[PDB]
Design a binder for these strands. Structure first.
Lengths: 103, 142, 56, 117, 110
RNA sequence: GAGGGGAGUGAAAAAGAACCUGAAACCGUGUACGUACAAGCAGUGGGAGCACGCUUAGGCGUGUGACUGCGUACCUUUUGU
RNA sequence: GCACCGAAGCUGCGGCAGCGACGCUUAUGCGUUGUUGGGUAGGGGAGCGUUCUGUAAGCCUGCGAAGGUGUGCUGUGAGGCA
């Protein structure tokens, strides 16, 4: 089966037993996240939304907490004008292993 | 999850057959560009061919209409001091007719190596027959 | 005149493609020569075509 | 109380020359040239990171407009249908469902036509 | 073994040496030695002694069986350059760097 | 002869007298991949294929980058490059 | 006439930073809330690193120091550790 849902910031296309990347949530380190926020569920055949959020659908998915993502070098430079600066960022992310698609 | 981009290998191209006889040029070439590129199909690629092989039937009898029929510019260059030469549509139909539709569509067609890879699949026939029949090609009209 | 830039080491290498010498190769032996020798030439001993030369 | 330089210079230069791996000519070798090219590359690296967002939205629209015209509706009229019936939040990345299942995307076109009709 | 054989401080530029050396690269020793014989160049007679000596050095020290041999690897690197100053017009002065070479010869059944 | 290899000394000989450490510029050799209808500050974003350790991975990691979106050095002085 | 495209604008989600208010606190700093964060000349503030002296007849260390050359990891950065 498969479904689509909305996390923080954006949506994702998800099947069961898949593992997908998510935002730093307040959920415990191994704990399960619950999406009632889901846009379609399909058994290989569709039961979509009318208005946003399907009536029965829920997606239960365990987390792995992770930490800080890969470094990026942000480079500000103007030519012939004596200005330059560098800045870094890691971000923070989590992954989730999917046990949901329940209705 | 990134875009489910199609591979070079796994897109299958296939074929059309197209009759120029009744058609208005440019507007014809436009449809040829979209089918040659694959843009009409579920392409989903900014950098590889997914589009049909297309061949042409009866190319000379195309209509360019208006008053442009007698006087469209067709500038062509040889690289020499007198190297500007000029033809117009009726003279190009009078001698060397297939190159007409080629240069008319080539300009509308995009870019460099990948464009030249599209351009190769086009085959113009002034004639009323073809020898790419071996492919068992499927007929199209718009 | 003069160059306007240092040309590249790649451009230098592409110039050199014809430089290397020819493998001489075609060196043969004859019956009473006793020597592997160049074609159409006397041997070091004096053999040409099984004639002894530099001799009577 | 003198000083003797050198050591932190070459370490900094090896920092630059390491990032300068995989270029061409002087750009993979020469310090004065590498220091220009790596900074200029960082400029492009920032700028292009915006244009990534531009590209992906267009390429999603590309496949949607194709899949839409097979079921028989152009993208502008199609998207207006998805809004005007039920304000649907099926989406541009999500429409890869169109690549995977056609009859699923058909149900989207069905209610898009149910707006338009 | 392939017992290392070298020569140091030859009078050549390494570029002219490579014209001789590259023909000898990867051939069998019998076919190579005749090429190195008839190759006219000044570096050829220099390299000829080094290859022939290399075969003798492998023969004596490591032990015999020269019969099917190749020269597997051969390569040249620069030596020093001799500095002089050449008198040219109006008192102008030239660097005149006289180049030297280091030929190195890996002599081998394989 | 020069020079080189064995043998031999010595903890060390890649310590060999032109000798401690021995970077870069520079020039080669060996291996992998790429490259002979295709135009531009020689990059970056995307990205197939192919070659390497091989993972509950498999398409994970690493190297290369066919093709391709966007891309007119740096510095100094200047109204302004 | 009705749609749609269209930027680094705006809103969406996370993270970081300055300056007021309000409450935990009752310095300090957090927790809210509000609003701000293009920039040369130029002013102000806050930082890293290097050599050398003190601490140090301490501490680490030929089971392998400095240096050199690689790899992995880490801080917002200059950089740092293994």
């Amino acid at each position: 089966m498969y479904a689509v849902f909305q996390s923080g910031g954006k949506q994702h296309r998800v099947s069961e037993g898949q593992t997908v990347r998510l935002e730093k949530l307040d959920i415990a380190t191994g704990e399960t996240v619950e999406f009632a926020e889901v846009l379609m569920i399909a058994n290989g055949e569709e039961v979509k939304i009318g208005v946003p959020f399907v009536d029965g659908g829920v997606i239960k998915a365990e987390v792995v907490a992770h930490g800080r993502g890969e470094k990026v070098k942000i480079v500000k430079f103007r030519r012939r004008k004596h200005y330059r600066k560098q800045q870094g960022h890691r971000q923070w992310f989590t992954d989730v292993k999917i046990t949901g698609i329940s209705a | 999850m990134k875009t489910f981009t199609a591979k070079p290998e796994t897109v299958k191209r296939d074929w059309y057959v197209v009759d120029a006889t009744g058609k208005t040029l440019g507007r014809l070439a436009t449809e040829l560009a979209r089918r040659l590129r694959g843009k009409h199909k579920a392409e989903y690629t900014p950098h590889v061919d997914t589009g049909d092989y297309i061949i042409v039937l009866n190319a000379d009898k195309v209509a360019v209409t208006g008053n442009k029929r007698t006087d469209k510019v067709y500038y062509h260059h040889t690289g020499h001091i007198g190297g500007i030469k000029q033809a117009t549509f009726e003279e190009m139909i009078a001698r060397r007719p297939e190159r007409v539709i080629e240069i008319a569509v080539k300009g509308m067609l995009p870019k460099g190596p990948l464009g030249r890879a599209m351009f190769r699949k086009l085959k113009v026939y002034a004639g009323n027959e073809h020898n790419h029949a071996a492919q068992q090609p499927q007929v199209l009209d718009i | 005149a003069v160059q306007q830039n240092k040309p590249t080491r790649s451009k230098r290498g592409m110039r050199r493609s014809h430089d290397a010498l020819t493998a001489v190769t075609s060196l043969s032996v004859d019956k009473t020569s006793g020597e592997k020798h160049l074609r159409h030439h006397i041997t070091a001993d004096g053999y040409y075509r099984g004639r002894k030369v530099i001799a009577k | 109380a003198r000083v003797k330089r050198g050591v932190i210079a070459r370490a900094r230069h090896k920092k630059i020359l390491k990032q300068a791996k995989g270029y061409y000519g002087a750009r993979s070798r020469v310090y004065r040239v590498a220091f220009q090219a790596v900074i200029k590359a960082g400029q492009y690296a920032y700028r292009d990171r915006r244009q990534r967002k531009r590209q992906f939205r267009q390429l999603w629209i590309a496949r949607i407009n194709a899949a839409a015209r097979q079921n028989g509706i152009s993208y502008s009229k199609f998207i207006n249908g998805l809004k005007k019936a039920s304000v649907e939040i099926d989406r541009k990345i999500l429409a890869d469902i169109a690549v995977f299942d056609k009859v699923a995307f058909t149900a989207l076109v069905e209610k898009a036509k149910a707006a338009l009709a | 073994m392939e017992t290392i054989a070298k020569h140091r401080h030859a009078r050549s530029s390494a570029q002219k040496v490579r014209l001789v050396a590259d023909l000898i690269r990867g051939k069998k020793v019998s076919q190579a030695l005749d090429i190195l014989t008839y190759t006219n160049k000044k570096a050829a007679v220099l390299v000829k002694k080094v290859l022939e000596s290399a075969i003798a050095n492998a023969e004596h020290n490591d032990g015999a069986d020269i019969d099917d041999l190749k020269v597997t690897k051969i390569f040249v690197d620069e030596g020093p350059s001799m500095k002089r100053i050449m008198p040219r017009a109006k008192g102008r002065a030239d660097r005149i760097l006289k180049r030297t070479s280091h030929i190195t010869v890996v002599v081998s059944d394989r």
